[PDB]
Amino acid sequence: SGFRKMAFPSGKVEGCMVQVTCGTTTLNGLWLDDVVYCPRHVICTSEDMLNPNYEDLLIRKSNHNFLVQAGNVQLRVIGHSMQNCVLKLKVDTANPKTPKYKFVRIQPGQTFSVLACYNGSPSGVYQCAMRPNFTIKGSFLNGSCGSVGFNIDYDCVSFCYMHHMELPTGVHAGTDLEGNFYGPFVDRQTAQAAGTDTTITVNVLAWLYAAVINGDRWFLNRFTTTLNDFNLVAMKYNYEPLTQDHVDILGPLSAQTGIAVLDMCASLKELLQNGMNGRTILGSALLEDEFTPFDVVRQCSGVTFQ
Amino acid sequence: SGFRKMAFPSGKVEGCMVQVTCGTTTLNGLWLDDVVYCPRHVICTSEDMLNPNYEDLLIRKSNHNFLVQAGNVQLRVIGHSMQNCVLKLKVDTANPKTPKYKFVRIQPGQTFSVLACYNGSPSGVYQCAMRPNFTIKGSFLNGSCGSVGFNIDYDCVSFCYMHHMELPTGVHAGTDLEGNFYGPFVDRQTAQAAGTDTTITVNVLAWLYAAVINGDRWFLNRFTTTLNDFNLVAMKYNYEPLTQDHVDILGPLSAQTGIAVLDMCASLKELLQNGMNGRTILGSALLEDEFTPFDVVRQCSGVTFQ
Ligand SMILES: *[C@](O)(C(=O)NC)[C@H](C[C@@H]1CCNC1=O)NC(=O)[C@H](CC1CC1)n1cccc(NC(=O)OC(C)(C)C)c1=O
Ligand SMILES: *[C@](O)(C(=O)NC)[C@H](C[C@H]1CCNC1=O)NC(=O)[C@H](CC1CC1)n1cccc(NC(=O)OC(C)(C)C)c1=O
Ligand SMILES: [Cl-]
């Protein structure tokens, strides 16, 4: 048993990670086939970044200006291209280690693994959810940009995130791999802010189910709520309204534990109202909301990858 | 910006995960050069494991009684030895993906990443800590055995743990890669109890520095303490004694923050006494003790691996 925050195994993503340098700026690219995907702000300097004309600065750039590096190997760049906020560097060699892959745009509430890299080199990996306000709570230092977020369904790598900026509050913003920002954010020096976050209710119930599967059940009660009456409470505390689709999505864990959603919902209403009364759940002193239904099923039924 | 429980990238260990089957029992093997290491309870039937004679059981097995699979490819076993609680299977092929590596035996309070495997397939990666009672709070289902713990020091993978058993309350025990157990446990299906866990004081302090490095300051007080005065209070909240070497080891972080260790101790001493009274630190409502001084430097100064 046990229950941890669990990243995907990162090896298939390490294989793709390169260093990209334009003038003074060095960060990370994602090397799939003969293309290297990196944030388009690799091109500009500390100046302009007030409000930089990427179309215009790219025209001036020479392929020679991009020093791309895979360990102890300079890759010849032979073409450059811009999609939204991502630079595409055509190079004269396809990546021997390209895995099967997809570019997907995840919905808020959905979780991925992040491989934090510096100078094309991976530092560490960690799990994190796309907040409803389209920020993520990462761990990103200068040089981290171009680091990516991904899910691994079997042998297929689904790339969902490339890193761009930090925000005030120590939260992060970035793009899908077609270079569109999650949320209303922009690749400038321009001053920017998250907007009010909400608690991902569906995920809190999932984790409660996770605790029950793992013996931690002190908070189970003989009481029941309607969906409506449950939302009337949780919504007061800035929790996502819970929907029938949410309740359906919780079907499998409801069945595995034998506890109905609207029963667990009465445990959740109580924990919000009276707090945890000095107790922990899965060794947490608050209600963790960064595990999806599927994340619990994965960890707790033990589904493997390759 | 941000701080996070961060696992080492698992790429280099993934290429060493094999499946080992002996009759009706399947678990994970660690394949380094021409040797596969697994737990020795792979030669047992579910009735042998109540009180087995592993020496006797191993005498009654041939090389062919070990089906070792690396992807599709089966590996021919050409020898077998038992070192303490691990099986060493000599195979006919050297692992091309074998990293530079060594075997270490870690101290309590030291952290490492776990690559949870089922059937020689890597499933998940998570950081944890050798608890002072010689257990690990991991995430392990049936089939997980042979999954290892490890650090990366630049490019050298240090293997520190192989997984063997679950103990009461959903904590875990295993061995170093010489098959010696951490703590007083045995390779047996017997009633075994872990012993009372305490909090890793030097780690909580390391994390209080992380809080302060990431702009969490509220818990700083205008007081200092003696080591002795600190231990008197910590003893009474099940905190491991803080020694002069723990203070000395905390020096670099003290110097980075300008906050004297024994002043940080005095802030911790107040937190144990008055509790946290509903406030968080790095988004935790309890004091984290699973980051080493070196982990905090690692992540805050962003050190990288290859
Ligand atoms: C990225 O460009 C990089 O790694 N380049 C080498 C960095 C990564 C961030 C800096 C440290 N933490 C990070 O996550 N991003 C930026 O520097 C980013 C580039 C903009 C085009 C998007 N960026 C520029 C300017 C200002 C900020 N934000 C900022 O200063 O935020 C506060 C919280 C005020 C410090 C920013 O992210
Ligand atoms: C491991 O052997 C395996 O994966 N084999 C295929 C397995 C690890 C799993 C099982 C559930 N959680 C885990 O960590 N270990 C065992 O099953 C071990 C075998 C060890 C040689 C003795 N094992 C066997 C019997 C009983 C127990 N523990 C047990 O009964 O746990 C409680 C009830 C909590 C005391 C055990 O770990
Ligand atoms: Cl907590």
mmCIF file with all atom_site columns, N, CA, C and O in Angstrom, chain B residues 236-273:
data_model
loop_
_atom_site.group_PDB
_atom_site.id
_atom_site.type_symbol
_atom_site.label_atom_id
_atom_site.label_alt_id
_atom_site.label_comp_id
_atom_site.label_asym_id
_atom_site.label_entity_id
_atom_site.label_seq_id
_atom_site.pdbx_PDB_ins_code
_atom_site.Cartn_x
_atom_site.Cartn_y
_atom_site.Cartn_z
_atom_site.occupancy
_atom_site.B_iso_or_equiv
_atom_site.pdbx_formal_charge
_atom_site.auth_seq_id
_atom_site.auth_comp_id
_atom_site.auth_asym_id
_atom_site.auth_atom_id
_atom_site.pdbx_PDB_model_num
ATOM 1   N N  . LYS B 1 236 ? 10.610 16.477 23.521 1.00 0.00 ? 236 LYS B N  1
ATOM 2   C CA . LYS B 1 236 ? 9.218  16.358 24.018 1.00 0.00 ? 236 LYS B CA 1
ATOM 3   C C  . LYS B 1 236 ? 8.195  16.447 22.859 1.00 0.00 ? 236 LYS B C  1
ATOM 4   O O  . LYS B 1 236 ? 7.016  16.194 23.135 1.00 0.00 ? 236 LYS B O  1
ATOM 5   N N  . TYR B 1 237 ? 8.599  16.683 21.601 1.00 0.00 ? 237 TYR B N  1
ATOM 6   C CA . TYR B 1 237 ? 7.688  16.586 20.421 1.00 0.00 ? 237 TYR B CA 1
ATOM 7   C C  . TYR B 1 237 ? 8.167  15.521 19.423 1.00 0.00 ? 237 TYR B C  1
ATOM 8   O O  . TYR B 1 237 ? 7.789  15.613 18.218 1.00 0.00 ? 237 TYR B O  1
ATOM 9   N N  . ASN B 1 238 ? 8.922  14.527 19.910 1.00 0.00 ? 238 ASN B N  1
ATOM 10  C CA . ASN B 1 238 ? 9.366  13.326 19.146 1.00 0.00 ? 238 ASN B CA 1
ATOM 11  C C  . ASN B 1 238 ? 10.254 13.753 17.982 1.00 0.00 ? 238 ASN B C  1
ATOM 12  O O  . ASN B 1 238 ? 10.133 13.154 16.881 1.00 0.00 ? 238 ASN B O  1
ATOM 13  N N  . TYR B 1 239 ? 11.063 14.786 18.213 1.00 0.00 ? 239 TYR B N  1
ATOM 14  C CA . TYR B 1 239 ? 12.045 15.305 17.244 1.00 0.00 ? 239 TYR B CA 1
ATOM 15  C C  . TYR B 1 239 ? 13.359 14.612 17.596 1.00 0.00 ? 239 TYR B C  1
ATOM 16  O O  . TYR B 1 239 ? 13.674 14.537 18.793 1.00 0.00 ? 239 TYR B O  1
ATOM 17  N N  . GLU B 1 240 ? 14.044 14.047 16.600 1.00 0.00 ? 240 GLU B N  1
ATOM 18  C CA . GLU B 1 240 ? 15.451 13.575 16.713 1.00 0.00 ? 240 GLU B CA 1
ATOM 19  C C  . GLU B 1 240 ? 16.315 14.667 17.335 1.00 0.00 ? 240 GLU B C  1
ATOM 20  O O  . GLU B 1 240 ? 16.196 15.839 16.984 1.00 0.00 ? 240 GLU B O  1
ATOM 21  N N  . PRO B 1 241 ? 17.252 14.313 18.234 1.00 0.00 ? 241 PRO B N  1
ATOM 22  C CA . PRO B 1 241 ? 18.219 15.278 18.735 1.00 0.00 ? 241 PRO B CA 1
ATOM 23  C C  . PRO B 1 241 ? 18.953 15.940 17.555 1.00 0.00 ? 241 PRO B C  1
ATOM 24  O O  . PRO B 1 241 ? 19.294 15.251 16.585 1.00 0.00 ? 241 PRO B O  1
ATOM 25  N N  . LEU B 1 242 ? 19.123 17.265 17.659 1.00 0.00 ? 242 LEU B N  1
ATOM 26  C CA . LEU B 1 242 ? 20.010 18.088 16.809 1.00 0.00 ? 242 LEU B CA 1
ATOM 27  C C  . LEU B 1 242 ? 21.405 18.137 17.463 1.00 0.00 ? 242 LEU B C  1
ATOM 28  O O  . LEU B 1 242 ? 21.517 18.627 18.603 1.00 0.00 ? 242 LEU B O  1
ATOM 29  N N  . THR B 1 243 ? 22.415 17.626 16.751 1.00 0.00 ? 243 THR B N  1
ATOM 30  C CA . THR B 1 243 ? 23.830 17.519 17.173 1.00 0.00 ? 243 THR B CA 1
ATOM 31  C C  . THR B 1 243 ? 24.629 18.678 16.593 1.00 0.00 ? 243 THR B C  1
ATOM 32  O O  . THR B 1 243 ? 24.134 19.348 15.650 1.00 0.00 ? 243 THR B O  1
ATOM 33  N N  . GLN B 1 244 ? 25.851 18.852 17.090 1.00 0.00 ? 244 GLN B N  1
ATOM 34  C CA . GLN B 1 244 ? 26.762 19.921 16.616 1.00 0.00 ? 244 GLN B CA 1
ATOM 35  C C  . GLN B 1 244 ? 27.044 19.743 15.114 1.00 0.00 ? 244 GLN B C  1
ATOM 36  O O  . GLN B 1 244 ? 27.185 20.752 14.439 1.00 0.00 ? 244 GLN B O  1
ATOM 37  N N  . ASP B 1 245 ? 27.095 18.524 14.588 1.00 0.00 ? 245 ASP B N  1
ATOM 38  C CA . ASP B 1 245 ? 27.363 18.314 13.140 1.00 0.00 ? 245 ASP B CA 1
ATOM 39  C C  . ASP B 1 245 ? 26.179 18.772 12.294 1.00 0.00 ? 245 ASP B C  1
ATOM 40  O O  . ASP B 1 245 ? 26.449 19.210 11.187 1.00 0.00 ? 245 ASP B O  1
ATOM 41  N N  . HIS B 1 246 ? 24.942 18.558 12.761 1.00 0.00 ? 246 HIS B N  1
ATOM 42  C CA . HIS B 1 246 ? 23.687 19.033 12.126 1.00 0.00 ? 246 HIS B CA 1
ATOM 43  C C  . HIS B 1 246 ? 23.733 20.557 12.007 1.00 0.00 ? 246 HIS B C  1
ATOM 44  O O  . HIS B 1 246 ? 23.498 21.053 10.900 1.00 0.00 ? 246 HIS B O  1
ATOM 45  N N  . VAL B 1 247 ? 24.066 21.265 13.096 1.00 0.00 ? 247 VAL B N  1
ATOM 46  C CA . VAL B 1 247 ? 24.264 22.748 13.080 1.00 0.00 ? 247 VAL B CA 1
ATOM 47  C C  . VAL B 1 247 ? 25.304 23.099 12.009 1.00 0.00 ? 247 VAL B C  1
ATOM 48  O O  . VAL B 1 247 ? 24.986 23.907 11.137 1.00 0.00 ? 247 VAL B O  1
ATOM 49  N N  . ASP B 1 248 ? 26.517 22.549 12.100 1.00 0.00 ? 248 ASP B N  1
ATOM 50  C CA . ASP B 1 248 ? 27.621 22.786 11.133 1.00 0.00 ? 248 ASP B CA 1
ATOM 51  C C  . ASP B 1 248 ? 27.143 22.517 9.710  1.00 0.00 ? 248 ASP B C  1
ATOM 52  O O  . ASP B 1 248 ? 27.407 23.353 8.856  1.00 0.00 ? 248 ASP B O  1
ATOM 53  N N  . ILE B 1 249 ? 26.475 21.393 9.455  1.00 0.00 ? 249 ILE B N  1
ATOM 54  C CA . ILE B 1 249 ? 25.997 21.014 8.090  1.00 0.00 ? 249 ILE B CA 1
ATOM 55  C C  . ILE B 1 249 ? 25.003 22.057 7.562  1.00 0.00 ? 249 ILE B C  1
ATOM 56  O O  . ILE B 1 249 ? 24.967 22.261 6.331  1.00 0.00 ? 249 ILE B O  1
ATOM 57  N N  . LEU B 1 250 ? 24.243 22.699 8.450  1.00 0.00 ? 250 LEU B N  1
ATOM 58  C CA . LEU B 1 250 ? 23.239 23.750 8.121  1.00 0.00 ? 250 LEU B CA 1
ATOM 59  C C  . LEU B 1 250 ? 23.893 25.110 7.813  1.00 0.00 ? 250 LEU B C  1
ATOM 60  O O  . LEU B 1 250 ? 23.125 26.076 7.521  1.00 0.00 ? 250 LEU B O  1
ATOM 61  N N  . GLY B 1 251 ? 25.228 25.194 7.841  1.00 0.00 ? 251 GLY B N  1
ATOM 62  C CA . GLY B 1 251 ? 25.957 26.475 7.724  1.00 0.00 ? 251 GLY B CA 1
ATOM 63  C C  . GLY B 1 251 ? 25.710 27.154 6.378  1.00 0.00 ? 251 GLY B C  1
ATOM 64  O O  . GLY B 1 251 ? 25.229 28.283 6.311  1.00 0.00 ? 251 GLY B O  1
ATOM 65  N N  . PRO B 1 252 ? 26.055 26.500 5.253  1.00 0.00 ? 252 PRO B N  1
ATOM 66  C CA . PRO B 1 252 ? 25.816 27.080 3.933  1.00 0.00 ? 252 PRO B CA 1
ATOM 67  C C  . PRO B 1 252 ? 24.451 27.752 3.784  1.00 0.00 ? 252 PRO B C  1
ATOM 68  O O  . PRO B 1 252 ? 24.426 28.821 3.249  1.00 0.00 ? 252 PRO B O  1
ATOM 69  N N  . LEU B 1 253 ? 23.383 27.157 4.308  1.00 0.00 ? 253 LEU B N  1
ATOM 70  C CA . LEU B 1 253 ? 22.005 27.707 4.142  1.00 0.00 ? 253 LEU B CA 1
ATOM 71  C C  . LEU B 1 253 ? 21.865 28.963 5.021  1.00 0.00 ? 253 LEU B C  1
ATOM 72  O O  . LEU B 1 253 ? 21.302 29.981 4.557  1.00 0.00 ? 253 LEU B O  1
ATOM 73  N N  . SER B 1 254 ? 22.386 28.897 6.242  1.00 0.00 ? 254 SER B N  1
ATOM 74  C CA . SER B 1 254 ? 22.474 30.024 7.199  1.00 0.00 ? 254 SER B CA 1
ATOM 75  C C  . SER B 1 254 ? 23.116 31.225 6.487  1.00 0.00 ? 254 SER B C  1
ATOM 76  O O  . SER B 1 254 ? 22.562 32.342 6.564  1.00 0.00 ? 254 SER B O  1
ATOM 77  N N  . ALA B 1 255 ? 24.231 30.986 5.783  1.00 0.00 ? 255 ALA B N  1
ATOM 78  C CA . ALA B 1 255 ? 25.054 32.027 5.114  1.00 0.00 ? 255 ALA B CA 1
ATOM 79  C C  . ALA B 1 255 ? 24.292 32.599 3.909  1.00 0.00 ? 255 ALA B C  1
ATOM 80  O O  . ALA B 1 255 ? 24.328 33.834 3.691  1.00 0.00 ? 255 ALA B O  1
ATOM 81  N N  . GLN B 1 256 ? 23.593 31.741 3.170  1.00 0.00 ? 256 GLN B N  1
ATOM 82  C CA . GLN B 1 256 ? 22.765 32.153 2.009  1.00 0.00 ? 256 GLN B CA 1
ATOM 83  C C  . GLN B 1 256 ? 21.601 33.051 2.460  1.00 0.00 ? 256 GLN B C  1
ATOM 84  O O  . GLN B 1 256 ? 21.187 33.867 1.658  1.00 0.00 ? 256 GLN B O  1
ATOM 85  N N  . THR B 1 257 ? 21.072 32.882 3.681  1.00 0.00 ? 257 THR B N  1
ATOM 86  C CA . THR B 1 257 ? 19.842 33.571 4.177  1.00 0.00 ? 257 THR B CA 1
ATOM 87  C C  . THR B 1 257 ? 20.200 34.710 5.141  1.00 0.00 ? 257 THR B C  1
ATOM 88  O O  . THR B 1 257 ? 19.371 35.641 5.317  1.00 0.00 ? 257 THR B O  1
ATOM 89  N N  . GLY B 1 258 ? 21.391 34.645 5.734  1.00 0.00 ? 258 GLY B N  1
ATOM 90  C CA . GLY B 1 258 ? 21.827 35.572 6.794  1.00 0.00 ? 258 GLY B CA 1
ATOM 91  C C  . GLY B 1 258 ? 21.125 35.266 8.108  1.00 0.00 ? 258 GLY B C  1
ATOM 92  O O  . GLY B 1 258 ? 21.139 36.138 8.982  1.00 0.00 ? 258 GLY B O  1
ATOM 93  N N  . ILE B 1 259 ? 20.549 34.063 8.248  1.00 0.00 ? 259 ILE B N  1
ATOM 94  C CA . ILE B 1 259 ? 19.845 33.631 9.484  1.00 0.00 ? 259 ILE B CA 1
ATOM 95  C C  . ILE B 1 259 ? 20.646 32.506 10.159 1.00 0.00 ? 259 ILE B C  1
ATOM 96  O O  . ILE B 1 259 ? 20.695 31.374 9.643  1.00 0.00 ? 259 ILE B O  1
ATOM 97  N N  . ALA B 1 260 ? 21.279 32.856 11.275 1.00 0.00 ? 260 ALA B N  1
ATOM 98  C CA . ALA B 1 260 ? 22.043 31.956 12.160 1.00 0.00 ? 260 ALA B CA 1
ATOM 99  C C  . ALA B 1 260 ? 21.191 30.714 12.446 1.00 0.00 ? 260 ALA B C  1
ATOM 100 O O  . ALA B 1 260 ? 19.956 30.825 12.651 1.00 0.00 ? 260 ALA B O  1
ATOM 101 N N  . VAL B 1 261 ? 21.848 29.561 12.437 1.00 0.00 ? 261 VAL B N  1
ATOM 102 C CA . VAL B 1 261 ? 21.183 28.248 12.622 1.00 0.00 ? 261 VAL B CA 1
ATOM 103 C C  . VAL B 1 261 ? 20.406 28.282 13.949 1.00 0.00 ? 261 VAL B C  1
ATOM 104 O O  . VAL B 1 261 ? 19.213 27.915 13.948 1.00 0.00 ? 261 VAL B O  1
ATOM 105 N N  . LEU B 1 262 ? 21.060 28.670 15.049 1.00 0.00 ? 262 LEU B N  1
ATOM 106 C CA . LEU B 1 262 ? 20.460 28.617 16.413 1.00 0.00 ? 262 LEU B CA 1
ATOM 107 C C  . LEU B 1 262 ? 19.334 29.657 16.540 1.00 0.00 ? 262 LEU B C  1
ATOM 108 O O  . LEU B 1 262 ? 18.516 29.535 17.472 1.00 0.00 ? 262 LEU B O  1
ATOM 109 N N  . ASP B 1 263 ? 19.274 30.644 15.648 1.00 0.00 ? 263 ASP B N  1
ATOM 110 C CA . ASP B 1 263 ? 18.114 31.574 15.548 1.00 0.00 ? 263 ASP B CA 1
ATOM 111 C C  . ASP B 1 263 ? 16.987 30.849 14.816 1.00 0.00 ? 263 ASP B C  1
ATOM 112 O O  . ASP B 1 263 ? 15.841 30.898 15.276 1.00 0.00 ? 263 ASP B O  1
ATOM 113 N N  . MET B 1 264 ? 17.306 30.154 13.729 1.00 0.00 ? 264 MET B N  1
ATOM 114 C CA . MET B 1 264 ? 16.300 29.289 13.066 1.00 0.00 ? 264 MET B CA 1
ATOM 115 C C  . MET B 1 264 ? 15.775 28.246 14.057 1.00 0.00 ? 264 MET B C  1
ATOM 116 O O  . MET B 1 264 ? 14.591 27.972 14.002 1.00 0.00 ? 264 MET B O  1
ATOM 117 N N  . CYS B 1 265 ? 16.638 27.656 14.891 1.00 0.00 ? 265 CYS B N  1
ATOM 118 C CA . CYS B 1 265 ? 16.252 26.656 15.930 1.00 0.00 ? 265 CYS B CA 1
ATOM 119 C C  . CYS B 1 265 ? 15.210 27.252 16.879 1.00 0.00 ? 265 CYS B C  1
ATOM 120 O O  . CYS B 1 265 ? 14.265 26.541 17.227 1.00 0.00 ? 265 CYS B O  1
ATOM 121 N N  . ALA B 1 266 ? 15.411 28.508 17.274 1.00 0.00 ? 266 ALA B N  1
ATOM 122 C CA . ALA B 1 266 ? 14.554 29.245 18.224 1.00 0.00 ? 266 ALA B CA 1
ATOM 123 C C  . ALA B 1 266 ? 13.178 29.506 17.585 1.00 0.00 ? 266 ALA B C  1
ATOM 124 O O  . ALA B 1 266 ? 12.168 29.382 18.289 1.00 0.00 ? 266 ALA B O  1
ATOM 125 N N  . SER B 1 267 ? 13.117 29.813 16.288 1.00 0.00 ? 267 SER B N  1
ATOM 126 C CA . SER B 1 267 ? 11.840 29.898 15.536 1.00 0.00 ? 267 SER B CA 1
ATOM 127 C C  . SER B 1 267 ? 11.114 28.541 15.475 1.00 0.00 ? 267 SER B C  1
ATOM 128 O O  . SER B 1 267 ? 9.886  28.527 15.680 1.00 0.00 ? 267 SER B O  1
ATOM 129 N N  . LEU B 1 268 ? 11.833 27.449 15.209 1.00 0.00 ? 268 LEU B N  1
ATOM 130 C CA . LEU B 1 268 ? 11.290 26.068 15.237 1.00 0.00 ? 268 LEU B CA 1
ATOM 131 C C  . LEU B 1 268 ? 10.764 25.742 16.644 1.00 0.00 ? 268 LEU B C  1
ATOM 132 O O  . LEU B 1 268 ? 9.675  25.180 16.765 1.00 0.00 ? 268 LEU B O  1
ATOM 133 N N  . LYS B 1 269 ? 11.546 26.045 17.672 1.00 0.00 ? 269 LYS B N  1
ATOM 134 C CA . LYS B 1 269 ? 11.195 25.787 19.089 1.00 0.00 ? 269 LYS B CA 1
ATOM 135 C C  . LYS B 1 269 ? 9.830  26.426 19.372 1.00 0.00 ? 269 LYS B C  1
ATOM 136 O O  . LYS B 1 269 ? 9.000  25.741 19.982 1.00 0.00 ? 269 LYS B O  1
ATOM 137 N N  . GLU B 1 270 ? 9.598  27.657 18.896 1.00 0.00 ? 270 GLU B N  1
ATOM 138 C CA . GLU B 1 270 ? 8.315  28.381 19.102 1.00 0.00 ? 270 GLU B CA 1
ATOM 139 C C  . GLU B 1 270 ? 7.194  27.659 18.341 1.00 0.00 ? 270 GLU B C  1
ATOM 140 O O  . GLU B 1 270 ? 6.065  27.551 18.895 1.00 0.00 ? 270 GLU B O  1
ATOM 141 N N  . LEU B 1 271 ? 7.478  27.178 17.125 1.00 0.00 ? 271 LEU B N  1
ATOM 142 C CA . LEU B 1 271 ? 6.468  26.476 16.280 1.00 0.00 ? 271 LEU B CA 1
ATOM 143 C C  . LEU B 1 271 ? 5.979  25.201 16.988 1.00 0.00 ? 271 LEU B C  1
ATOM 144 O O  . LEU B 1 271 ? 4.787  25.013 17.000 1.00 0.00 ? 271 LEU B O  1
ATOM 145 N N  . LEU B 1 272 ? 6.871  24.400 17.576 1.00 0.00 ? 272 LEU B N  1
ATOM 146 C CA . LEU B 1 272 ? 6.539  23.177 18.365 1.00 0.00 ? 272 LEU B CA 1
ATOM 147 C C  . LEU B 1 272 ? 5.664  23.554 19.558 1.00 0.00 ? 272 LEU B C  1
ATOM 148 O O  . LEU B 1 272 ? 4.825  22.748 19.943 1.00 0.00 ? 272 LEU B O  1
ATOM 149 N N  . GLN B 1 273 ? 5.876  24.723 20.145 1.00 0.00 ? 273 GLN B N  1
ATOM 150 C CA . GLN B 1 273 ? 5.242  25.082 21.434 1.00 0.00 ? 273 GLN B CA 1
ATOM 151 C C  . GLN B 1 273 ? 3.842  25.597 21.146 1.00 0.00 ? 273 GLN B C  1
ATOM 152 O O  . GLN B 1 273 ? 2.904  24.971 21.606 1.00 0.00 ? 273 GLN B O  1
#
